[PDB]
Every structure is written in C-alpha cells, then in structure tokens.
Amino acid sequence: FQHMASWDIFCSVVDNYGDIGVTWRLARQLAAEHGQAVRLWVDEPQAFARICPRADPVAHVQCLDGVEVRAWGRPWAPVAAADVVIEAFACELPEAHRQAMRERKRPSLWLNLEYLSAEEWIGSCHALPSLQACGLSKYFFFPGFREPSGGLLREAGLLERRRRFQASVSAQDEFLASLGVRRKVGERLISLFAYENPALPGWLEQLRDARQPSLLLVPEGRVLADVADWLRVATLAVGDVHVRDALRVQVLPFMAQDDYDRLLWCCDLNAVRGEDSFVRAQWAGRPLLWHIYRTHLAKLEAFLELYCAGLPADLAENLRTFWLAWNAGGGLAGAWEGLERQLPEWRREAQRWADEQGMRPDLAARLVQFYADWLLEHHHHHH
C-alpha cells in the first residue's frame, strides 16, 4: 500500500513556453517523486511538444513520465474531478469541472498557482483562502524566494547532480559535443535566451571588442533575428557559427527541458527570461541575466534587492545597472565593462545563492504538504 492523491493541473498557453514549462515540471515531479496520479490539461499541445520532444502533439491523451497529458477541449468534455485541482496562473476552470469538484463527497482542494515574485507582500497572501460563489474556496499559492511562500520548484537531488556535472570536464565536453559545440581554451561560454531586446547590439559590440573571447550560444527562438541583424546575415540556422573578433556566435536547437539545464550548467553566464529558465539559471549556480517582458519593474527591483543583498557593493551596483538597462533597452556599456571583471566573484556568490535556496523545502513538497494538512483539517484531525 501507498497513499496516493489525484491532481488536475490546468494550463492555458497564452504566449511563450514558461507557463507550460512550469506546470509540466510540477506535474512530472508530483508523479515521479511523490507517486501521485496527475492529469495535466493543456489548451495548446504544440507548445508542450516544444519543451517535451517525446510528446505526440496530435494525441488527445498520452502518458509521459507518469503524467496523463490531456488536451483541454473546446468544448470541454466532462470528467470527474481530482482530489486537488490546480488552476495555474488564473487560467479559469471549465464550468463542468467546478461542478464535478463540488459534487465529490470530499470536494476537491482548489489551488491557484501564482507567478513567482520576490516582492515581500506575497508572504501576506500565500495560502490565502477565497470563498467562491459556488461555495468552494480556492487557495492562492505564491512561489517565493523567502518565507512565508510556496518556495521554488526543485527536483530531488538536483544540486548534487549539478555539482557532479560541473566537476566533470568530460561530462560537459560530451554534452556540448552532442549540440555540435566545442569550447576553446580560455573562451567564456554565454547562453542567450531572451525576448526581442534593443540593448542586445550594444552588448554584442562589447563582447566583440573585448580582450577575452566569448562563445555565445543561442537556442533558436525570438532573439535570433536580432542576432542575425547584428551579424548582418540574412539567415541564421541551427549549427551556424559566426566569428566577430573576440565573439563567436553559434546557433543551438531548441532542446528538451533537461538538456537546457545541462546547457545552463556548462555556461559561465546564462541570459534567461520569463519564470522557469530564470529559476533554472539560479540552480545552475552561475551568473545570470534576466529578461522580463515589459508593471514588470516591481518584480525586477524586488529580486535585485534580495539577490544583491549578499554581494559586494561594487558587484551589486554593476549587476543592478546592467540588469535594469537590459530590461530598458540600452545603456549597457559602463555596466558590462565593470561587471565582466567581477564574473569570478559573482560566480562564487551565485553558488552560495543556489546552496542557500537549496536548503529550503521545494515547492512540490510544499504543495503535497499543503494537501496533507488541508485534508487532516477538513476531517478535524490532529496533525
């Protein structure tokens, strides 16, 4: 015997990949690490196929890594509701599903999974119940970088695996070779995952004109047209390499989520965006550059306050200036010169940040614990 609860996770893909990226990561961890029964409902199967190449985008139901991945139909096909229903990022549940949740002898626990924020105020709202009209309550679940919050997604054993990988030159060289990448001695490795960014050509010129060489690895995506314009090339295809003095640019394929982790683990600096890659870059224990797509400023400044609190003043000031300019479309010159000379110290601090965050109970564990305490309380039992 083993305790098993069922989970419905609802995901509406509006733009980009992090909403399915985060809910898929969570779904897989609930199934694989906690032995839960998980249904992940996705309204756009093509997005899911991008982050999970094993998936069949035309199938209405399929089982991947123990998760039952199901197409969110229009119109909605009525099904029974799980023990827990997660409404990710306020995507709005099907009406018939709310009826099914309330008809159960034990009504479904209804959670709203929120976007991640370092803003202090989310602590006052984490786990807040909200009575709905139908008589069910939902609970807001706010991931966060400090307590109280719902924590951060982090797989069992992740940092131990990351440390072993980064300690093995051969493991890194083998992984990079599988992408067609061969680092040169003394060449700094930078990954670029961003939105369209008018600050990019100014940074590329600084990488081109530097004393030390850089290899810029660009998974296919938005920013590639911007890079192609800066390179003055009409086409940029997977596998293409272009050299501009101290800067080498190489186009990567858009790879599976786990392979993208390994890329982040190889690089000396990871430019990332959104929500999931933002956190994966932190688990990589390496310098990072975060692109939020434009009321984004509150989240950016709040994270900088927390992330910079442990850095030396000069590193903190250059990091903040660069990140703000990176998200404001220009003004990177003085920031990058000063920031580049501090990358070794920043790397040591990034490792410490990852280790400290790694001591906090991870988000999936907190979610499973939330259900356990809620269930016991629902039956007026001790804990």
Please state, in angstroms and as integers, the Cα–Cα distance from residue 74 to each residue in 10, 48, 101, 103, 302, following that order: 14, 18, 20, 23, 39
By the rule CB under 6 A, 275 interacts with ligand TYD: yes
Active site residue 377: no
Length of the chain: 383
By the rule CB under 6 A, 45 interacts with ligand TYD: no
Positions in 171-230 near ligand TYD (CB under 6 A): 193, 219
Q: Closest CB to ligand TYD among 219 and 287?
A: 219
- Candidate list 250, 277, 282, 342; residue touching ligand TYD; CB under 6 A: 277
- Candidate list 8, 21, 142, 226; residue touching ligand TYD; CB under 6 A: 21
CB of 259 to ligand TYD, least distance (A): 7
What is d(CA 305, CA 297) in angstroms, rounded to the nearest whole number? 12
CB of 137 to ligand TYD, least distance (A): 29
Q: Report residue 227 as tokens.
A: 């890079």
Give the CA diameter of the chain. Answer: 69
Check 114, 261, 275, 362 and give the catalytic one: 275
What is residue 92's DSSP assignment?
A: -
By CB under 6 A, the count of residues binding ligand TYD is 17
Strand, coil or helix: 269: strand
Residue 61 — φ and ψ, nearest 5°? Answer: -135, 135
Q: Closest CB to ligand TYD among 83 and 275?
A: 275
Neighbours of 197 (CB within 10 A): 22
Of 228-236, 249-257, 313-321, 366-374: span binding ligand TYD (CB under 6 A):
249-257
Q: Closest CB to ligand TYD among 20 and 228?
A: 20
- Candidate list 7, 13, 18, 323; residue touching ligand TYD; CB under 6 A: 18
What is d(CA 15, CA 207) in angstroms, rounded to the nearest whole number? 30
Gaps after residue numbers in the chain (C–N over 2.5 angstroms): 294
Q: Report residue 202 as tokens.
A: 């100014």
Please state, in angstroms and as integers, the Cα–Cα distance from residue 378 to each residue in 8, 107, 370, following that order: 20, 10, 12
Residue identified by tokens 């009826």 is 99
Q: Closest CB to ligand TYD among 21 and 150?
A: 21
What is d(CA 189, CA 213) in angstroms, rounded to the nearest whole number? 9
By the rule CB under 6 A, 276 interacts with ligand TYD: yes
Q: Is 256 annotated as a binding residue?
A: yes
By the rule CB under 6 A, 112 interacts with ligand TYD: no
CB of 306 to ligand TYD, least distance (A): 19
By the rule CB under 6 A, 326 interacts with ligand TYD: no
User: Can you say how many angstroms the Cα of residue 59 is from the centroid of all Cα atoms in its chain?
Assistant: 26
Q: Is 275 annotated as a binding residue?
A: yes
Q: Closest CB to ligand TYD among 49 and 79?
A: 49
Residue identified by tokens 């307590």 is 147
Annotated binding site for dTDP: 17-18, 195, 255-257, 273-277
Binding residues vs ligand TYD (CB under 6 A): 16-18, 21, 51, 193, 219, 254-255, 257, 260, 273-278
Please give the positions annotated as active site: 19, 275
